[PDB]
Design a protein around this ligand. Structure first.
Ligand SMILES: Cc1cc2nc3c(=O)[nH]c(=O)nc-3n(C[C@H](O)[C@H](O)[C@H](O)COP(=O)(O)OP(=O)(O)OC[C@H]3O[C@@H](n4cnc5c(N)ncnc54)[C@H](O)[C@@H]3O)c2cc1C
Ligand SMILES: Cc1ccc(-c2c(-c3ccc(C#N)c(F)c3)nc(N3CCC(N)CC3)c3nccnc23)cc1
Lengths: 134, 660
């Protein structure tokens, strides 16, 4: 009485389930038996597929990485660096992180700065509406 | 102190029983002070008798040893003493009388059966001054207390245990009789198929599961009300299946939830692997593209420089992106290496296990002398509240000593089989025949009949005993409703002790479930080299249709495959009880069958009152009274319960024909 011993399971639900007929017992137990084999074999399947995908990754991305130097961040915009900028603004829009990575010695600070210092004579507005065309 | 005597008499020391309410309506409805006076006089009189039950506790002696303000009210004391003595709470059993028996007797009573319940009534009635004759079909007293005796061999085929002395009226009987009581060492090894002691580690998991499975049925009954099913009533065995099944269902349910979260993870990995192939593919191109853009050597304009620097930024982005995806692929890769190593239990119970569980079930069929498919789920254990305290004892010298003792002094007609019981407003005749020569017939006329016929005899489909008039429906239906079970023994007598003399009992584990009762338990209790083999559950019914020699065969086998084909002599002497076949028993003892309830036990015990002879003459006196193991709700199926029922009917009969 009270609440079932610890680790026995006797929900209301279940009892009608295994009683409502004579073999409702060794039925509910046999249908679970099969839902097991079903899920087990669909694991065998996703394993075979995951094993193939793993083969296609053999090599990793090893012969594909390129060192990424340093370029100690400066603050003078050389004419080269502005031209990189305005091109990055056309390729990236506002991804000021990428734009600073392209230029190399400018950080998201002056990248945001430049965006409004030169906003006028580098027709930066037009440039950004080009990237928006996407 | 005095409060201990109340406990030893199955009475609350501090309040008045509903029985006492009936005879002392003054007290119970009165000042709480007098109730305490009553209770003390009661408790102290009980103490006095209990402290020396070898001799009669006269009213004189009681008032003598009463002290303080209590021997003040001598009418109250004489009342309490008489109540205790009528109802058999003092001066019961075999005591030395003080005041000797009435010269001239009053009333005549025929008692059917001289089992313990019959004998106990007979002694009480005789000491109240009535004329008592017992009619017994067998050539011996004791009924289902049946001791086998030959040379120095001695072995109970009937009752053999006193189930505790704390509050057991046999406490008093054993002080009165040379009753050699022996504690039972309650450790018991189990031996399997080919003959292998079950590891102690195992024995305890299964036992613990057995007990958990019982509580489960109790919760299944009281909390969920799993008591009717298909209009029939639920048995303990049914409920045990249902509990066991639901545990297997839960085991499967957990395997499903586990592998089902392996597959969720495997499908997560898969989704990841895909992002990662289509980044290796995407990165491959970005390399080619960056390499070609680097072919344009650096005397080069700014769009061409932007395309080298751009493809590079692009290429190391897709490179970080793929590296975080391949750490997420490592966290997933191990979460899955763990689940593959944390698999819930494969089973609820192994085959080796379920057969050890089946022995614990046979142990339960043996105690209740019946298949668990017959026991009422709701009520099978209804007498458990009333268990005695202290160790369980065997009677080393044969339980028969007790009946034989009680029979001294009584008028017992053996080999007299009652055939018809006639009860009328004027009195009764019992008709009996001689069991040796069926034709010799007897007519006994009396004021009252105490029927202590076994429930199995009363149950006999073509009546072995005819009641005239027939018993009313309320009584017959109680008789059809409760169970009368079965339980048999093989007694094995040897020249040499070849078992372990330090163990009292030890088990044999059956191959199958069906045969879990077949010779499942073995007892060494007696001085002589004697071994008892129990046949419980559905085996008992069947083993009775098998010859004696086969039974002892199967027996010596089991023992040989456990002790060595060489340490096991032939038996000098063998007996095999067959209680269901015995026509003065028709079984072993009662059990609360499914559909019954301990209420039927009370119905069994109601006396019958014949109708008027002349029409319109006043409603008579009750004439037919019932005692016996099956007539006592709180102590069925035992000897103390038989004895108690005898004491009960004696007081009730005397209250009727001698007045209270
Ligand atoms: C195998 C077995 C083991 C037991 N073990 C224990 C145990 O360990 N502990 C325990 O406490 N209890 C035990 N019991 C129960 C106990 O033995 C009984 O409850 C009790 O002894 C029966 O008392 P009773 O007086 O009600 O009936 P009984 O002792 O059966 O007395 C009835 C009498 O009526 C007689 N009779 C039947 N038909 C007729 C007729 N037509 N005319 C005349 N007489 C008739 C019978 O022969 C018998 O003598 C056991 C019972 C069995 C069967
Ligand atoms: C070692 C041992 C084994 C069984 C018991 C036992 C018996 C019992 C004893 C000996 C024999 C024989 N031979 C027998 F046949 C039955 N009987 C019990 N019952 C009968 C049903 C009733 N409803 C309530 C009392 C009972 N109950 C609780 C605990 N132990 C027991 C006691 C000790």
């Amino acid at each position: 009485k009270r609440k079932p011993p610890k680790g026995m399971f006797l929900s209301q639900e279940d009892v009608e389930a295994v009683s409502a007929n004579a073999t409702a017992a060794t039925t509910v137990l046999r249908q679970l038996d099969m839902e097991l084999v079903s899920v087990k074999r669909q694991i065998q399947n996703i394993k075979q597929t995951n094993s193939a995908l793993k083969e296609k990754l053999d090599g990793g991305i090893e012969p594909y990485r390129l060192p990424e130097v340093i370029q100690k961040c400066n603050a003078r915009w050389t004419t080269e660096e502005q031209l990189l900028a305005v091109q990055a603004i056309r390729k990236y829009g506002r991804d000021f992180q990428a734009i600073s990575d392209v230029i190399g010695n400018k950080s998201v600070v002056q990248v945001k700065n430049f965006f409004v210092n030169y906003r006028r004579r580098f027709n930066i507005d037009e440039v950004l509406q080009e990237w928006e065309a996407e | 102190a005095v409060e201990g005597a109340a406990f030893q008499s199955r009475l609350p020391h501090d309040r008045m029983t509903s029985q006492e309410a009936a005879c002392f309506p003054d007290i119970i409805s009165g000042p709480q002070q007098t109730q305490k006076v009553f209770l003390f006089i009661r408790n102290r009189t009980l103490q006095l008798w209990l402290d020396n039950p070898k001799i009669q506790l006269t009213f004189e002696a009681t008032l003598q040893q009463l002290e303080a303000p209590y021997n003040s009210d001598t009418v109250l004391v004489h009342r309490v003493h008489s109540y205790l003595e009528r109802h058999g709470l003092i001066n019961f059993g075999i005591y030395k009388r003080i005041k000797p028996l009435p010269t001239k007797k009053t009333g005549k009573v025929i008692i059917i059966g001289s089992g313990v319940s019959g004998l106990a009534a007979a002694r009480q009635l005789q000491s109240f001054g009535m004329d008592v004759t017992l009619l017994e079909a067998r050539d011996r007293v004791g009924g289902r207390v049946a001791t086998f005796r030959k040379g120095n061999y001695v072995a109970d085929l009937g009752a053999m245990v006193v189930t505790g002395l704390g509050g057991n009226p046999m406490a008093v009987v054993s002080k009165q009789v040379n009753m050699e009581l022996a504690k039972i060492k309650q450790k018991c090894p189990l031996y399997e198929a080919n003959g292998q002691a079950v590891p102690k580690e195992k024995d305890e998991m299964v036992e613990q599961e057995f007990n958990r499975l019982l509580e489960a049925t109790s919760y299944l009954s009281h909390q969920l009300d799993f008591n009717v099913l298909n209009n029939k009533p639920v048995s303990l065995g049914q409920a045990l299946e249902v509990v066991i099944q639901l545990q297997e269902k839960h085991v499967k349910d957990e395997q499903i939830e586990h592998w089902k979260k392996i597959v969720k993870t495997q499908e997560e990995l898969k989704e990841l692997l895909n992002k990662m192939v289509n980044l290796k593919e995407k990165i491959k191109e970005l390399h080619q593209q960056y390499k070609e853009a680097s072919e344009v050597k650096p005397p080069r304009d700014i769009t061409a420089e932007f395309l080298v620097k751009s493809k590079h930024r692009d290429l190391t982005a897709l490179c970080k992106e793929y590296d975080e995806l391949a750490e997420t692929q490592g966290k997933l890769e191990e979460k899955l290496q763990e689940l593959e190593a944390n698999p819930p239990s494969d089973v609820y119970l192994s085959s080796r296990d379920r057969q050890i569980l089946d022995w614990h079930f046979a142990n339960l069929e043996f105690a209740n002398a019946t298949p668990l498919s017959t026991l009422s789920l709701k009520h099978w254990d209804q007498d458990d509240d009333f268990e005695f305290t202290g160790s369980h004892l065997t009677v080393r010298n044969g339980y028969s000593c007790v009946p034989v003792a009680l029979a001294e002094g009584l008028d017992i007609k053996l080999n007299t089989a009652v055939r018809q019981v006639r009860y009328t407003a004027s009195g009764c005749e019992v008709i009996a025949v001689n069991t040796r020569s069926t034709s010799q017939t007897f007519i006994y006329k009396c004021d009252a009949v105490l029927c202590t016929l076994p429930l199995g005899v009363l149950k006999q489909q073509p009546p072995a005993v005819q009641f005239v008039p027939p018993l009313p429906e309320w009584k017959t239906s109680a008789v059809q409703r409760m169970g009368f079970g079965n339980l048999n023994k093989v007694v094995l007598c040897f020249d040499r002790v070849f078992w372990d003399p330090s163990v009292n009992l030890f088990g044999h584990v059956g191959s199958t479930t069906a045969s879990r009762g077949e010779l499942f338990l073995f007892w060494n209790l007696y001085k002589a080299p004697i071994l008892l083999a129990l046949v419980a559950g559905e085996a008992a019914g069947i083993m009775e249709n098998i010859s004696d020699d086969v039974i002892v065969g199967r027996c010596l086998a089991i023992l040989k495959g456990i002790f060595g084909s060489s340490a096991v002599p032939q038996p000098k002497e063998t007996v095999v009880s067959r209680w269901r076949a015995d026509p003065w028993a028709r079984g072993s003892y009662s059990y609360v069958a499914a559909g019954s309830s301990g209420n039927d036990y009370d119905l069994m015990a109601q006396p019958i009152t014949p109708g008027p002879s002349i029409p319109g003459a006043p409603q008579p006196i009750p004439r037919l009274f019932f005692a016996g193991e099956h007539t006592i709700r709180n102590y069925p199926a035992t000897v103390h319960g038989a004895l108690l029922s005898g004491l009960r009917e004696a007081g009730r009969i005397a209250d009727q024909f001698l007045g209270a």
